[PDB]
Amino acid sequence: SRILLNNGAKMPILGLGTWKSPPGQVTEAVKVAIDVGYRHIDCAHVYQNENEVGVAIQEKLREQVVKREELFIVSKLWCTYHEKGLVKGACQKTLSDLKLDYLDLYLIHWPAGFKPGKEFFPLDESGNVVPSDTNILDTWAAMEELVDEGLVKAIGISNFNHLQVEMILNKPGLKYKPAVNQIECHPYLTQEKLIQYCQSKGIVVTAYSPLGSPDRPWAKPEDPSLLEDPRIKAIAAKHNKTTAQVLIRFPMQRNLVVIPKSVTPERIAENFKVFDFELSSQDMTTLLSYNRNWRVCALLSCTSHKDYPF
Numbered sequence: 152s153r154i155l156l157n158n159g160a161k162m163p164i165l166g167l168g169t170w171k172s173p174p175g176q177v178t179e180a181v182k183v184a185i186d187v188g189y190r191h192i193d194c195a196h197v198y199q200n201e202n203e204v205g206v207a208i209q210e211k212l213r214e215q216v217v218k219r220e221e222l223f224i225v226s227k228l229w230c231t232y233h234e235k236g237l238v239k240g241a242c243q244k245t246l247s248d249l250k251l252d253y254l255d256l257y258l259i260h261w262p263a264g265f266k267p268g269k270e271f272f273p274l275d276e277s278g279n280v281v282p283s284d285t286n287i288l289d290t291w292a293a294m295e296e297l298v299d300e301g302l303v304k305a306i307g308i309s310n311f312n313h314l315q316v317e318m319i320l321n322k323p324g325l326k327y328k329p330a331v332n333q334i335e336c337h338p339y340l341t342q343e344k345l346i347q348y349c350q351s352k353g354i355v356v357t358a359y360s361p362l363g364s365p366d367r368p369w370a371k372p373e374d375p376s377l378l379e380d381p382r383i384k385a386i387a388a389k390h391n392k393t394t395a396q397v398l399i400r401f402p403m404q405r406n407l408v409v410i411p412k413s414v415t416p417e418r419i420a421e422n423f424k425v426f427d428f429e430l431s432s433q434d435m436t437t438l439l440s441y442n443r444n445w446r447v448c449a450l451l452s453c454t455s456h457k458d459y460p461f
């Protein structure tokens with residue numbers, strides 16, 4: 152089902168993630184997702200696969216499998232486009248690739264701006280990211296323009312910490328509040344403080360990496376594994392569900408949106424089968440208890456940026 156955003160639109164609480172979905176597999180992944188019921192796709196220019204996502208979206212619209220109004224397509228402004236005069240063209244490139252004339256939601260992908268150019272991570276000779284002097288507030292004003300030009304129906308933020316959310320909410324002359332803050336969230340990083348702050352302000356939180364991103368490129372064999380945690384397996388077994396299904400249902404019952412990624416057709420379908428069972432309150436609190444402040448999405452080359460959020 153769907154959650155009401157502070158722009159008046161409804162957002163499906165379950166979406167399909169596309170980071171790391173290979174370009175030769177993601178068109179079929181998104182076709183399968185729409186065929187089995189998904190109506191929300193999470194995209195980003197930096198994922199380098201929006202053309203191939205778009206081929207799937209467009210084919211399903213052409214085939215009349217779904218209407219555009221029924222889809223909720225999200226993408227994100229990359230860090231090298233935080234500049235007033237680059238935001239619109241970045242949005243338009245994403246629209247072109249996705250074969251759309253609007254996005255349902257467009258996010259500032261990270262609070263940090265980087266030097267524009269070809270490189271997504273421009274580095275100095277010593278390996279530090281090179282910042283942009285543009286502030287989160289001027290980037291937000293540029294996002295607000297996209298609403299007013301009809302390119303996007305909603306704007307939001309991603310990886311913004313408490314203080315950064317507050318900065319936006321306190322922006323002089325704020326025209327549109329952020330509708331969403333998309334952040335990493337799973338039983339090893341439960342985010343209770345940031346979620347309660349955002350929800351108290353009427354901002355909907357989307358949980359990314361809800362399975363722990365086991366395919367993240369910097370994974371190590373020794374790292375914690377949610378999918379293999381026997382405690383979570385035990386809750387799944389009790390409910391006759393998979394561990395992944397429990398990990399997807401968990402954020403749903405916290406009033407979060409969740410965006411698990413898969414390119415495996417059988418898992419795409421399995422991951423959607425989460426509307427026919429309920430975790431108990433005790434199950435929810437037990438899952439919350441596994442927090443270890445273990446963050447899979449972080450990056451050393453960006454840790455000296457003034458706006459690095461963590």
Ligand SMILES: NC(=O)c1ccc[n+]([C@@H]2O[C@H](COP(=O)([O-])OP(=O)(O)OC[C@H]3O[C@@H](n4cnc5c(N)ncnc54)[C@H](OP(=O)(O)O)[C@@H]3O)[C@@H](O)[C@H]2O)c1
Pocket residue numbers: 167168169170171193194260309310333334358359360361362363364365366367378393395396410411412413414415418419421422448
């Ligand atoms: N805003 C941002 O900064 C940000 C950062 C990270 C992620 N995200 C968004 O969040 C989405 C989800 O996060 P994520 O991609 O990091 O990881 P994730 O969804 O936590 O995990 C994806 C991994 O789980 C596997 N998997 C999926 N379903 C499974 C199932 N039922 N059983 C066993 N394994 C399963 C997938 O394998 P297969 O694909 O091989 O099936 C893939 O290796 C991303 O794709 C992206 O859209 C946003």
Ligand SMILES: O=C(O)COc1cc(Cl)ccc1C(=O)NCc1ccc(Br)cc1F
Pocket residue numbers: 170195197198199230261262263448449450453456459
């Ligand atoms: O950022 C994401 O959505 C997922 O992670 C990545 C995806 C791609 Cl395609 C490339 C690189 C990352 C990646 O490294 N993301 C981490 C990241 C990025 C920027 C900043 Br300011 C901080 C930070 F921790």
Ligand SMILES: [Br-]
Pocket residue numbers: 261262263453456458459460
């Ligand atoms: Br950042």
